[PDB]
Each structure stands twice: as structure tokens, then as C-alpha cells.
């Protein structure tokens, strides 16, 4: 991999994770693909990024929020409840950990089980206060809502219990890789669409 040396020591691990195909600090970024036509063009990846910390204005204009690296937008959804408003770095560490775990058992690269977890938690349809009326939610409220439900559920499980936030988040998204009837997100989503039929 044509190594290069200088005066200050730059560890060979670093000397390995360069222009050579882009990965996360330790996870591959290519071969991660959305397995649902819908939300494609709305799950920003490849655009590889080694660490999810990007000082990018994503709200100056409405839709640029979709061009944001998903795992980062997913990470911004943790610095919530005041007690975590800010704490971005503490979050970044919880995610590097979380994926250190999803891959614990699932061989599948974490940057792919993430998309698999967002796929099965986007409500195809919902309801609104007209009784109620059946409504198809947008392809980005789809993601926004998927991330929101996944993180609130994991945050819900980490409270008053020894298990760490990273562990609960990991187990929640593994169950959400393909709905297994146990993630707070599969449940809420399916029931947020099981009432869209109530008005038809």
C-alpha cells in the first residue's frame, strides 16, 4: 500500500486507513446499500466519512438535511432531553461503540445493518385529524421518524437499567434490521400504520 514515513510517528493503522478504499475508522463504507427503492437518494452514504462529526449547516435550506451523512443525522438524535443537549462527543463515542457491538454478533457490516434498521421503521402510511384520514408520509419524514422512534426507544430502555445506552441501541437496531416483533420501533411503526386502515 506504498507506505510513506516522516519524522513524527504516524501509526501503521493510520497508514492503512487512507485513500485505499474508504471505511469508517474500522468499518467499510462501500457495499452498504439501501434494500428498499424508497428512501434511496435520502440515505446519504458513499460520501464516506471516517467519524460522524461534521460542522455542516444542514438547515439554512430545507432539503439539504437529506445530503447529510445518515449515521451522523442518526447521531444528532442522541444529544436530546437537555441532559444531553450538546454532549456531541459523548454521543460520537456511544455510536463508535454501538457499531463495535452490532458487528459483535451480526457479521454484516454495521454501516449496513443501520440502513436495515431504518428500512423497517418507516411508516408507509399514517393518519391525521380530519374521525381520522389515511395519509402516506413523505420519504424523508420516513427517515426522520425512523431515527426518532429508534433512538427514543433505545433511550427508553437504557433508563433505570444497568445495560448501557450503546447496548440497548445496538440490540434495538439489530431487531430493526428486519423487524423481529421486539424493537419499540417495529411495534410503534406497525401500529402507526395499522390505523391508517381505520379510515378507508
Amino acid at each position: 500500500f506504498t507506505p510513506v514515513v516522516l519524522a513524527t510517528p504516524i501509526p501503521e493503522e493510520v497508514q492503512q486507513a487512507q485513500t485505499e478504499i474508504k471505511l469508517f475508522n474500522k468499518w467499510s463504507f462501500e457495499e452498504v446499500e439501501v434494500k428498499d427503492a424508497s428512501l434511496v437518494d435520502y440515505v446519504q452514504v458513499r460520501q464516506p466519512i471516517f467519524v460522524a462529526h461534521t460542522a455542516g449547516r444542514y438547515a439554512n435550506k430545507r432539503f439539504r438535511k437529506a445530503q447529510c451523512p445518515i449515521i451522523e443525522r442518526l447521531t444528532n438524535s442522541l444529544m436530546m432531553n437537555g441532559r444531553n443537549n450538546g454532549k456531541k462527543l459523548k454521543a460520537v463515542r456511544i455510536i463508535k461503540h454501538t457499531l463495535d457491538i452490532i458487528n459483535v454478533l451480526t457479521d454484516q457490516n454495521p454501516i449496513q445493518v443501520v440502513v436495515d434498521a431504518i428500512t423497517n421503521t418507516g411508516p408507509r402510511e399514517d393518519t391525521t385529524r380530519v374521525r381520522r384520514q389515511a395519509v402516506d408520509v413523505s420519504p424523508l419524514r420516513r427517515v426522520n421518524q425512523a431515527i426518532a422512534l429508534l433512538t427514543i426507544g433505545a433511550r427508553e430502555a437504557a433508563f433505570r437499567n444497568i445495560k448501557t445506552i450503546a447496548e440497548t441501541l445496538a440490540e434495538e437496531l439489530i431487531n430493526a434490521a428486519k423487524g423481529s416483533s421486539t424493537s419499540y420501533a417495529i411495534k410503534k411503526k406497525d401500529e402507526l400504520e395499522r390505523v391508517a386502515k381505520s379510515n378507508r
Binding site: 427503492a37 424508497s38 434511496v40 430545507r62 432539503f63 408507509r124 402510511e125 399514517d126 391525521t128 380530519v130 384520514q133 389515511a134 395519509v135 402516506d136 408520509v137 413523505s138 420519504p139 424523508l140 419524514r141 420516513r142 426522520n144 421518524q145 400504520e193 378507508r200
Partner: protein, 63 residues
Amino acid sequence: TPVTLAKVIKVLGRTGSRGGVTQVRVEFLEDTSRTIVRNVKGPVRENDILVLMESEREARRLR
């Protein structure tokens, strides 16, 4: 689970009382050239894609 595939071609406007929903004409790129008009909940742009679960239904202006 028969699903669909619709791509918005033009935008209609804000329906519903609070104005948070929007009418939009969709277009299936499977058996294209067809007409359908569905309404959404999230914010949308031109050219997005959504999936219908009941292709034979269409609501109208919501009170």
C-alpha cells in the same frame, strides 16, 4: 404484500385545516402513464418517490 411505487411529478398544495398535509399527483413507474392523486404528511419536493399499499383509493380535499 402487494405494494406500489409512485413518483410525484407536480405539487398541488397545502390541504387540511392546519395546513400540514399536501395534495400531490403521483406516477407509478410500473405501468406508467397512469393518474393517481395521494396526500402526504411529511414535507415533500418535486420528483420524490413514495409507496402505496392500497393502489385503488384516492381521498380529496380534507376538512
